[model samples]
Target: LKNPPGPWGWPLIGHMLTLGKNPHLALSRMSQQYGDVLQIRIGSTPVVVLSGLDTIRQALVRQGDDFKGRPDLYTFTLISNGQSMSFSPDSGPVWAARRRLAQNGLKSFSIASDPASSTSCYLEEHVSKEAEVLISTLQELMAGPGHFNPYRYVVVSVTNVICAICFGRRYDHNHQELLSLVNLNNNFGEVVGSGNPADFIPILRYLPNPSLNAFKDLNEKFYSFMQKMVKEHYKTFEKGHIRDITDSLIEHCQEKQLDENANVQLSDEKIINIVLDLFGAGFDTVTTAISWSLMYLVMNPRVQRKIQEELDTVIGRSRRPRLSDRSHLPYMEAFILETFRHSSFVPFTIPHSTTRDTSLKGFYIPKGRCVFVNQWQINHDQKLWVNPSEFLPERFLTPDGAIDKVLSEKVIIFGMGKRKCIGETIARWEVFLFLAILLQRVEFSVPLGVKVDMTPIYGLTMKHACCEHFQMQLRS
Candidate 1:
């Protein structure tokens, strides 16, 4: 009947001061007292925090479109120069226009592109080849058969895997081409490390923000230079055959370049933005997931051993792991799910905005108020997850040890409804191939005498302080 119930705020900072170090955990606890759909302020901005499975579904799923808008944070405005699809603040037709365009492009290429005789599509072919590169890279790192950070190699290899699929080529592990690609995104994770306050407080916009400073320099001239990168693809477009994801996307937009009336209008800029978004997302989230998986493996040897045993029983050593083998290897899939669940890796989905004033469970929410769905809360809900804090992939298994879709569906990592993470199919397939091939090939363990930390330092991607140092023993 009125605004959602909330804790009162202070003079300027509002409730931001009370959030402590882990805002996700802080907010989750608050929801227990204030109700699932709670309101609070970060600076002067009024934000609605949605928690638990049912409440989130009601807002993000049942009334999805009404909540599909993105916030107009100052940094977000600068980061994309205000035109970015993912952060555009446009929930109107333009948002759909871009999404419809991107989704169609993704399907033709990554989702169901041409296949390898042994693989499903270029996705399988690409991930398979890159996994081999990663294995060889691992072999090189282990001359001492030594202790080193595995994820450095993991992140680089994942980035290269994406390049091959998107741009029609992959790079050597140490190539400069790949180096620049990886370095470009370093500022992003930081700016959102805890969220730049400039996003909320207008007065803080000009304050010295280390991360946002770099973001400005990076983004201000980004598209001009990036457009040139997208140039070769456009120049090469006139040739026969759409060669890669870039080509496929451009080809579709080139042909359609039309308005709803089919009056035939299109912008090459649409393809450019879509391509950059895909590239931007590829290396970060997938690489982080693989990194977390390795973190959990070394931190919990019994868990790692069971996964290896499962790999041996289901996938043996004769052939490389393939996409078709996913369902057959229940532990591996469950392990991945557990990593997604237990890590609660994403914490929050990208912020959503109220497209129009709306009410949820009898509380009124004003239009344009930024919203954050606490995915971490749902992942750790006590009533739903047995011993929610324990890392137990077996929980996802049934008495028969088969994957229980009934249970697995409750882990809401990819999100639900309209604004769900679009690259999900590719990301799921990507992680399975990387982990399965690696586990089948090597053993992960902590280095002797070196302290290892499994507690993830809360950040944009949840950096685990230093699981970076570990040893890999290649199994024959």
Candidate 2:
């Protein structure tokens, strides 16, 4: 690899010291200095850091196919036993088969209720009922004269929704199982970003690394538990035959046993992993998006007010917001776009490895080379956005003040290409509905003297330090 220009570093340490406890600011600083296509060696692992739209686009758009494999996360691999989708399987039939099952589980474009459909059309109704439960939970938390963490509610809402889809059931916020899942997930977040030495030095992994070992136990325990969940779902599917996605996958697997070539269809083991993938994907991603959006709203009140006003005018405070209302609330949708843009969450997307040798922006990327886009850097580039650091939603507005311009060739939150987020359509639908409704009913105020930092915790996902002490109260 040619030395791309970047910060000077000590021989072995590289820029590790500069990375510090909080590396995003350092990364942002590096972006300012290096322009783009900067390289740094993280403990002998030569990594290329891409910033700004044009530079990242050079890698992602021009060379997207070339860049497709995930970077080796040694610690993550240990914890997961390399089972989950966030790190398991490259571009192969196994990956395609898994991904297809997930997409097939959701509703068709028409969204008509068919008992046969995996994503129940009644899901909207279920979410509304769950929201009411959340509102009550928030009221109790607020009345106790102590601050409530918005993350709690956000996690509960999405987790319940995912459980419903996966198992034909939802969890109470205080349920032991639900709480354990969240705690384990939160711990996983901490461990992944810890940047443990085991990631690079494979030998260090065997020395009873407490954090790594504990996470492995948690993951396996969760896996064992979820296997039971899958069995129950299978039983339920076979009996009453409700149309949850998990049930549909089981049905599909049984029907299509094999092909003329006898290419392995899907095994029970593969089915278990696929269900786990759906649980992790549907649960964590939506929760992360909604929780971060809530934090953004608390931080930017003017944007908050604009959204509340839009909801008032369009949705009316008396009625609950629904998926159908998304089109009318352009500014709110734009604000959601801005949240995805401004947050440092998942700065680098999961890496994509190429199926063949390819070229991007006049550079030849050899076959089997790992590739991924730097999402945070691309979204925050000053050339693509004015006041790229500022929390402004108006940038997404047209000269006439609407949501059309936001989708123009720039935004890459859901990513771009043949392998862009498959659940994009449903995610957009959920984001719009959740943000619009919540903003209308509540006012989030920072606790007195609490200094909320906008910086995100390092990991596979963005965990905000500022999210801890923030409070949301009903607006009278």
Candidate 3:
């Protein structure tokens, strides 16, 4: 079976050396020469890189089921404790069941299932409360000279939302436990960003890599934290009343135990891991999206003004913006789409694998081969967008000033198909409300004598290098 064209690789390392610090960027470059569907290797593992919108859709959409399987990377297995709902390499019945349960639980807690609804849902209520916390936190930063990093402010706000949804409560901004969780999550992102060779070359697991070691240690801490929460929830869990996601999960698992004859399902370990999975999936992603949005807004004041104008016109200062207002705020929605497109946060999606030997573009791909969808390549592909490199939100709009539904659908930031991010709706809602509220009351800008740092630090997500601080002014 002939594989797609690709650069030749070294004996043991394969193309590892070629991919450099950011494998996504390297893969995008490789795709330019070798075609969209190209084959390369990471250590001894064969990786088929799918780039361009058509190629990605062909693999992830049209033949979605065939590519739904996640590769059994060592890092994921190690972090997941051999029984995680999301990171489990096994895309079988168990993973499917757990995903369904989590999805339903999130939906139940969502502020609005109907995108057109103006009324607040449970999720929106939490978000709205967090917005106040966020605004208060920013006000404190303003007290310090009107210039400070919004990193922790954004993280604390977003993390609290997840906390509320996950455990039915929120933590204080200065809570030690909350800060530790954020730090651990940040460290995890660094480890993931620094591609682990052990993931590809199994033998490298024994090597002395500090990052890999830190990753394991952090996972242990995360696991202990999750276990502690699960135990606490179990002590007060009630049937028929789902307080949050943890409660919903407990109910679902307990439901399987219909009678004394029925066997117990979803052990404590499984439940803890599932909760951890949900937090991991929901937290950093939205945080990074918001961070990037702020950065872009500062860089392009025009875009920020346009968004504010729309917000002022559609949602006056009289009330907070609602999901219902999203329909009337095409410019704001387009700005969010542009941010996702420009950032391409998860540039190369979590590695997927062919469940069975498959063929694409006349190339044979063996079962278990790691598949990397080049999201950055597709998002920035000039063939798909005008001035792909520019920070123009208008590209997302149609001639009639409405969002181009088809083009907007192509922005696969949350990814595509069944394996797509489970928290897409929540993520979008959080970003929209956070951005709207922040922009409604604050003005972000570069401080005097300080140049704007637009450089991106590619990690688990595409984060701003200057994430720790940015200048801002409060709006009356």
Candidate 4:
């Protein structure tokens, strides 16, 4: 008969004053008092904050269709000129068609079989080949530089993996164009993450906001970066043959030019923009997840050593890791699982909304209301784990020394249902292989008396304040 249960707010600001600097943490605390489906107003908008594993699943999984809507925030419009498949306002037929294009397109490169590597898919081939380059690069840095961050090389190597999939080309390490684009502004997570007044409150948009403006500047830079690649692909595109994801997109644009039909209709710009969506989605978030995993290995040397031991025993150092080896490498899988669970680097999935007036868990939510799943709360909830604050990788393993399937599914990072991250399969294997290749060969350490900061700054994807300045050593 009414909205969800929540704390009463002030006259105008609503719950804005109640929230601290870190809304994710603050809302986790709020969930404890107000119950799982917590509602609070930011400015005048009513925000439904879902917590607990059950409630989140109920809303996102059971009621997925109703909750699959993307809120029309001010900042949301600027990403790829509002054409981004992930951020755009279309979760409709057009969105579905674009998603199919992305799914099949990425599948062809990421998991598809390759003639060059009879044993594995292109993912392993692309990743390990890049990893070898990165390993050699690390060895060079280790020989001379007393203290250097592996982040620079790590980011570039990860970017190249996606580049190989998207553009079918890779750049040299420290390429000026690539570096400048990725380094534009780190403030994206801060602004783009849910519950910023600038996004929720209409009045704040008029005020001077360097953070939001910086976010816009970042998008602008991304557009220019993508424009260059798309233009190059256009020059050599064929009507019959698709060279890459870009060419595939161009080929489709020519389809609509031929058909011009309205059913599942997508404009030329919408089709081309999927390329931007792929790079943007595949690039930063996966890079951040890998970076966080590396920092953890740097911080927890005992666990890191154990991971190395697992690599030594299972992988044997006689040969490099493969995607098929994941099952046999149980301890290694546990470490990756724990890394995702412990860090919860991506604290929240992209924001979601009610597509139509829908009832969830016996509560009524109006059509088009803003909603977000408090993933931080679910990952840290005491009901789900004993001493959720502590980091323990062994929790995910069975007594027989194998990765526990049920427990692994409990560590929800990518999200659930149709609203889930589509590139999840790619990101998962990327993180697994990326960590394995590096751990099998390199040992991460820090200088005397130095500490690795574990504090995460919130954004669309949460990132460590500073995980840089790590010292790398080659394994015997």
Candidate 5:
């Protein structure tokens, strides 16, 4: 029943002032002062932060169900309307059902129908085609032969993959709708990453706050956009010909509609929220990871060459690299793993909470209390990794120079336990295929005498602050 120790702060505000803009870094520093399991107050709410791999595993994996609760914060409630699979309502039957629906739909998109199937799976095809588009787009950009920010292209390519799956089609890179969605997504990320003060202090929700207002505006934009897409799908949807996740969901809803004994029926609101969930889940992390991948390649040219060599040796230039070729490229695999570990894109993992009053490592945690597993701490812990800050991919390599499968597996890039990122399966292939194809055809780097800044701009996902374009040229 003992509360974990944390820094003392002024009344009401608690440790809020100390958190600054990035709670991940702030809490990480505090964990060094106060052991791994530390409790810090955010406004009136007591939040238990689990640091280190062992402690995080103990809480999230070993006692996962107890820690499976999702915090019903004002921002999440406003955005999800309590219908999303990933946010709101903490944990209960509704969450469980929604989780099942999402998991099943994702599986359909991810896995191949059979081992001998001639065609790629839905997600694999999406990654493959979009990666090609990216390579072509990069080629055009490289032709200009000057600094050009690749973030826009990278995000669009990555977003298209999700778009193809969710909406059953991809948009032109310059499409106004696509641009609007991307802007709204970035805005949402900023709001969430900023950590709404109202999340901890309920009274602040009533007050006029630009951050909270931006979040609400972003949600409205997203809702209206997704509603339009869902309505369009409903109008053109043909039963028995489910093209994508949205179609499958519509069919599921229709089935439930016909079934008298069904417990849950998918309303338009739920459908829209589920689509938005996929958009957020599929778009943000993958886009940020790809952006970081290219940036890291530019920053570490030697590592870039090593990956290119592996790609050339394994897949050859005659053909584009496929997800199936992922295992054949060890150094490339190591690079991706290292990027996931080093970048720490989703730094905090989605916030988790206690399903009921529970004790973690003998520290008292009350029901519905918000809990966060500091992924940044685990990924960069000096005790866990050698030269944790350095970009060394060899740490994941074996004595024989192959990727150390066991060691590589241990890196908790996506997250851990039951609530760990479900998109990890496709994300791995997406990064691999995208990087593989790009590296096979082009070399990425900063101009001579120019140094690429590696500073991270903290947001819903951490990204490079530098908007300067890196150089890319066709590899001979």
Candidate 6:
């Protein structure tokens, strides 16, 4: 079988060794060893990497339908029951219905309105409160603490914003079960990094001897949690007091009967799973991105100072930021854009499968073939940017220092074309609002001597273990 161009790997192990401890490093190396587009086997799966703008767009835009299906590993089917959008369900009436509901419910506003309104809502409500608690938590750490991990704080802030939107409630930063959610999400990443043998042997999971992985355990944990949440939601909302996104979904089910297929109903079970999908999808990606943003802020105090100075000059501390104010903070928006380009949270957006034999960039991707938009590779491709690996916000700016180009191409963090992130508007608002509100009130810095590794920690989302520091405190 002729493959797209790539470095030869060890026989049987087949490039597994090259996919290293750090996926970011592995992808960075792979991008160099292979061409911008290359193919490798992630355990028997012939994964094609699409690195760079035109290639990513080609796979995502021109070949959108061709690459719309996601990889169908056992892990995905278990978690989503093959019902969710992120999972690789076949393109059919059922899938179409689900996708339509998600777009109309979540992304319609993102595509239509100015982006900043969602962010302002996030900032004004949840992020502002979370930031204060985080700052207070940090002060405690500074006063009498042993070594601390701000990971939880970052997780809580991002998680709660999504929860607030979905469930209409924010969790306490130290909420034990919320941590369980993060732990479950993070554990899923570990399993993926460990590699799904099922991605290879196919039948390895069914062996009586059994092959248990992070995916299995995490899937069980998440299912159990969502089952509990769904049961509670059903009972609590039964009294007719409307609440949360779940309430809205429940109401929808009551209003409309299942389609003729009988398989098309959004049952309580389905709603729970879909809500579970939203939790996994919405919270984890942005949490990692927010953490990366903080890493940059700590390492480049100048950038932090510049952002604060710009904010001070433009908006001042007298009023908290609104969506209206984001226009005035072009540099902040650019800085956020640069962070995404620089530290793309999910290196390869997600593995996608070609529905039929298709031509991508003059190469034949056979039917059922898996493709990845190697965003990390594209974002860091030297061909695309002058210094691709550097944290330079200037690249996103016009000569007049405005944020026009970035709002167009050069940014694929939230992904592209039709299958792009459904919650992107909410996410953008969550990120920008979180950053803006926090930046207005406080400045963050890492520990005295520890260096922030711009290199990513391998997981479901690209994260840096050493990134969180800069004990947060409101500026006096």
Between which residue pairs do clashes occur in model 6? 119-429, 445-470, 446-470
lDDT of 1 at 196: 50
Mind giving the per-residue lDDT tens digits that candidate 4 earns over 1-476?
A: 66789988996889897776678888988999978887898887888988888888888888889888898877889889878888876788888888899888888778988767788888888898898998888778778876676667777898899988889898888678877766545576677788788876787787897777787887888788778888988887777766678888777777666665554457777888887878877778888888877877777788999988988888788898888888788888888888788778777788898899998777899999888888888788888887888778888888998888987888988888887888889998998998888888888887657766788877778877654578887778
Candidate ranking under lDDT, highest first, comes to: 4, 3, 5, 1, 6, 2
Residue 150 shift from truth in candidate 3, angstroms: 0.6
- Residue-level lDDT for 313 in candidate 4: 86
Please provide, for model 2 over 1-476, each residue's C-alpha lDDT reduced to its tens digit, 9 standing for 90 to 100.
Answer: 34456788868667767767555556667878875666565566555555667666666667655554555566546543465554654556666677777676765321445354454455565566677777778888877856777777778887776677666778878888887877444566555653344554556678767767777778887788777876776666663454577677677666656545534544556655666666666677777888888777777778788888888888777877877677788888788887787874666666555557665444445565444356776677777778887887887888887876644346667766546777677677666656666677877777567777766777657777635676767876
At residue 158, give the lDDT of candidate 1: 86
Q: Write the per-residue lDDT of candidate 5 for residues 402-441, one digit (tens) a residue.
A: 9877777667767788788777888888878888878888
Candidate 6 achieves a global lDDT of: 0.68
Residue-level lDDT tens digits of model 1 in 9-49? 99688888777568889898999999889988888888888
Q: In candidate 5, which residue ranges exceed 4 Å CA deviation?
A: 113-117, 206-208, 264-268, 449-451
Q: After superposition, which runs of candidate 3 have C-alpha atoms over 4 Å from their true positions?
A: 112-118, 193-195, 259-268, 467-469
TM-score of each: 0.94, 0.87, 0.94, 0.96, 0.94, 0.86
Best TM-score goes to which candidate? 4
Query: What ranges in model 6 sit over 4 Å off?
Result: 1-3, 9-11, 22-36, 81-83, 107-124, 193-198, 201-214, 238-242, 258-268, 404-408, 466-469
TM-score of 1: 0.94
lDDT of each: 0.78, 0.67, 0.79, 0.82, 0.79, 0.68
Q: What would the TM-score be for candidate 6 when compared with the true structure?
A: 0.86
lDDT of 4 at 468: 52
Cα deviation in Å at residue 129, candidate 4?
1.5
Task: Quote the positional error of residue 99 for candidate 2 in Å.
Answer: 1.3
